[PDB]
Symmetry: C2
Subunit: 104 residues, 2 copies
C-alpha cells in the first residue's frame, strides 16, 4: 500500500546523519553526495533538508557554523547514532532468533 | 538517548515479523518475543493491543477467533505483506546508498 512517512523520515534522517558523521557539510554538498552515492536515485528536496536540520539543531544533535552554512555532528549526535545502531543490531538478532526458534 | 519514535519503529518491526512467521495471539507473541530476546524484551499486553488497534485500523493486520475457544488470533493481511516487502526494499536501498557514500 505504501511506505509510511514516518519511515521515509527515518530513512532520510539515517542517511543525513551518516553523511554528517563522515564530515561537517553544507546542504548542496550533501544533496550532491547523496545523489552520487545513490547513483541518481534519490533527489532530496532542499526544503526537506533544511527542515530536518532545523529539528536536529533544536534537539542539539547537530550544530551549525559559517564557512556557506556548514553543519556538524554534536556529541549527543555521535552517541545517539551509536545507540541507534546498537539497538537495531539487537533487534536484527531478536529476529534471527525468532527464525531459528520457528525452525526448531 | 534512544528517541521514542525509534523505539516505536523497532517494536512495530518485531511484531510484524512475528506475524509474518505465523498468525499468532497476544500472549503467544509476548512469549515468543521474550524467548527471542533472551529475556531482554518483555512486552506488555496493553502495549500490543495499542499497536494492534492502529495496525488493524490501517488494514495491515486483521483478527479472527481460534480454538480454549475465543482466542483472538491476528494475521498479516495482503497489504501488510506488501508493506513489509516495500520496507525491506527501501531500507536495503538505503544501506547500499550509505556504503556508496563512504566509497566516494
Amino acid at each position: 500500500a505504501e511506505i509510511p512517512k514516518e519511515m521515509l523520515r527515518a530513512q532520510t534522517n539515517a542517511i543525513l546523519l551518516n553523511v554528517l558523521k563522515q564530515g561537517d557539510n553544507y546542504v548542496y554538498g550533501i544533496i550532491k553526495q547523496v545523489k552520487e552515492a545513490s547513483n541518481g536515485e534519490m533527489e532530496l528536496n532542499e526544503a526537506t533538508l533544511y527542515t530536518i536540520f532545523k529539528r536536529l539543531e533544536k534537539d542539539g544533535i547537530i550544530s551549525s557554523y559559517w564557512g556557506r552554512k556548514y553543519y556538524r555532528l554534536t556529541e549527543i549526535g555521535h552517541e545517539n547514532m551509536r545507540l541507534a545502531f546498537e539497538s537495531w543490531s539487537r533487534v536484527d538478532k531478536i529476529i534471527e532468533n525468532l527464525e531459528a526458534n520457528k525452525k526448531s
